[PDB]
Every structure is written in C-alpha cells, then in structure tokens.
Amino acid sequence: MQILLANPRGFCAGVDRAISIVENALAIYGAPIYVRHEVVHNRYVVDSLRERGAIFIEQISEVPDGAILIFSAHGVSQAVRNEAKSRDLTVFDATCPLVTKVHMEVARASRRGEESILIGHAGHPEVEGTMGQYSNPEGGMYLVESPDDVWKLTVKNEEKLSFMTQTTLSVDDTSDVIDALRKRFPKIVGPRKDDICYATTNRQEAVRALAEQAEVVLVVGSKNSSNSNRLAELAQRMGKRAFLIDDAKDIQEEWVKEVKCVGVTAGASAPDILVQNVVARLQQLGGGEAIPLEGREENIVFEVPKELR
Ligand SMILES: C=C=CCOP(=O)(O)OP(=O)(O)O
Ligand code: SF4
Predict the structure, then answer these.
(1) Whose CA is nearest to atom 5 of ligand 1?
(2) Active site amino acids
(3) What residues contact residue 190 under an 8 Å CB cut-off, 6+ apart?
(4) How far, in Å, are 125, 142, 165, 249 from residue 170 at the CA level?
(5) Does the annotation flag 269 for ligand binding?
(6) Are 149 and 159 in the same domain?
(7) Is the dihedral of CA 220, 223, 228, 229 positive or negative?
(8) Which residue from 269, 193, 257, 192 is spatially nearest to 231, judged by alpha carbons?
(9) Number of domains into which the chain is organized
(10) Same domain, residue pair 30 and 19
C-alpha cells in the first residue's frame, strides 16, 4: 500500500501562536491558567494542556477572581470581553489575527449602523465571537449558512449592506453563498473573495490533490474542528471514502484492506505527532514509506505577544 501525505497539512500560524500563548502562560505564571473554550479544536492539544494545569471553561462565571484567563484562537464577543474586563481578570487574547481582521470589519459596520451578513455555521465559537462584534440596534447582523438562507433573508436597507465570512469554511460552498448574496442584494459590499484564511484555502487545495491520487483519505482532526471536517467532506464529495480521526487508534482495518493508495492529511489544529502515529499504524497495516506530495509553500508566522515571551 502506498501512503501519500497532503501538503500543506497540520498546524497553521494562528494555532501555533494560540498554543504557545497557553504554554508560555503556564511557564511564566504556573497552574492554573484558565482558557475560555478549547484553545483550538483538538482533543490531544486540549488534553495535553489540561494535564499541565490549564482549565478550559465555557463561561467567564466559571473563572475565579484574580485568575489569568486566555481567550481561545476562535475569538470572543464584545460581551465576553467586557465581562472579563469588568471582573478581576488578567487577560491574554490568543484570537488568531485573521479572525480579529473580520471582527474589525463587523465593528466598523456596527458603528455606521449599516447591516452586515455573516456566512458561517450556527453555534460555532468563531461565529458567536464575530456576530458578537455587532451591537448597533439601528443596523442589523444576520447569519446565513446556505443559498436557501439567503433566499429567505430580509433586511432593512439593502443599499447599505456588507458581508463577512467565517475563516474555516468550504471555499466552494462559500462561493455558492456569495453568488446568491450578490444575486439577491446587488449593492452588497464585501472582500474580493471571502474571509476564508490562507491555511483553510491551502489545506482544501492540498486535499483535492491528495484525493485525486488516493482511494481513501484519513484526516487527522477532532470532531468539532470545522476546518478538519471540510477536508474530509471535500474528499467524500470526490467519491473517496474519507474519515475524520483523532488518532491512530481510530483507524479500522477494513477502511484500508486491499487499498493500494491511502492519503493522510491533518486539519490546522492537529499536531504532527498524531500524523506520525497514523503513518506508523498504516505501515503496520501494509503501508510503505510515506511520500509527501509537492505543495504550496506557507511562510506566515504570528508571534506571541511580547508579554508572554
Ligand atoms: C481559531 C481557529 C482555527 C483552527 O482550527 P480549529 O481550532 O480546529 O477551529 P475551527 O476549524 O473549528 O474553526
Ligand atoms: S485556521 Fe486560519 S484563521 Fe484559524 S487560527 Fe489558523 S490561520 Fe488563523
């Protein structure tokens, strides 16, 4: 069996920064460090950090007075930020810069009282945070997930309307939503293409190339990682069996019995040690040396704040 590895795969710049923020806080201040939400959506990274003294909460009401609190990479609403700010808390913000860029635009639209539409998945923490930048009652902030959502939406003033997207969507399904938004609201303003980040766009491009060669694709990533689920979905829609797995223990032998080419990739929040263990398990099941595919180069790094060096 041939093993092919997608390139790029695995950690993006926002995930490597966010995890460094928590580890550096642990190293500078000791346990416990409180973290609002999973720092990133990966069970191995979160379990790692829990065992070293990070405590992951959903609500600021779970954090004690005087504590150090870190917001996760996905961002937080103004309400959450204000709630932390009103409490005794020392706050470090691990929001990815590419989520913050979208937040600044929604805040701008809110100040102007002009309505905004976000394309994204209901209940995802990034969507809560981004919708949570809009507060002006005179405007409006609306969520759409699909063309049908667009076809049902009514707004107050379609001459003054803008749109934004979540960072970790399907490039192709988002393009379909934007085509619908422009047909329904021809004066709508947005970015040139979408707010999907370089890491999401690149990993989807890489998994497309992987699935063109592989019969079965394994995507290393947790169930609640949006971007990881998009990579599995992309390969499934190409007619390949594709599985989202957290680690090598999840691989079922039947998925690769008599398969001649298996592809492996990883979402933006999955560490490379998990992909190494997956390759080791595929080699127990008959695979050879893993062959990395040629891929688009990534060169972006985001530094931790100087306070946490
Ligand atoms: C912040 C961030 C994204 C990094 O990956 P993630 O933590 O898996 O988040 P989503 O893909 O669910 O958005
Ligand atoms: S997936 Fe993109 S927006 Fe999200 S943390 Fe990574 S680089 Fe930032």
Answers:
(1) 269
(2) 126
(3) 162, 163, 164, 178, 181
(4) 17, 19, 11, 28
(5) yes
(6) yes
(7) positive
(8) 269
(9) 3
(10) yes
Residues 184, 270, single domain; the answer is no
Technique used to solve these coordinates: X-ray
Q: What angle do CA 95, 98, 102 make, to 5 degrees?
A: 95
Q: Are residues 189 and 211 in the same domain?
A: no
Asked if residue 176 and residue 110 are part of one domain, the reply reads yes
Which-ligand-closest: CA of 127?
1
Same domain, yes or no: 179 and 233: no
Task: Say whether both 71 and 82 belong to one domain.
Answer: yes
Structural domain including 171 reads: 97-196
- Same-domain status, 74 and 28: yes
Ligand 2 first shell, C-beta below 6 A: 12-15, 73, 96, 98-99, 167-168, 197, 199-200, 227, 268
Cα 272 to middle of ligand 2, angstroms:
17
Task: Residue 124: give its domain's CATH number.
Answer: 3.40.1010.20
CA–CA gap between residue 124 and residue 226 (Å, rounded): 8
Q: In Å, what resolution does this model reach?
A: 1.6
Q: How far is the CA of 74 from the centre of ligand 1 (A)?
A: 6
Annotated ligand binding at 227? The verdict is yes
- Among 11, 15, 16, 225, the mutation site with the greatest number of ligand 2 atoms within 8 A of its Cβ is 15
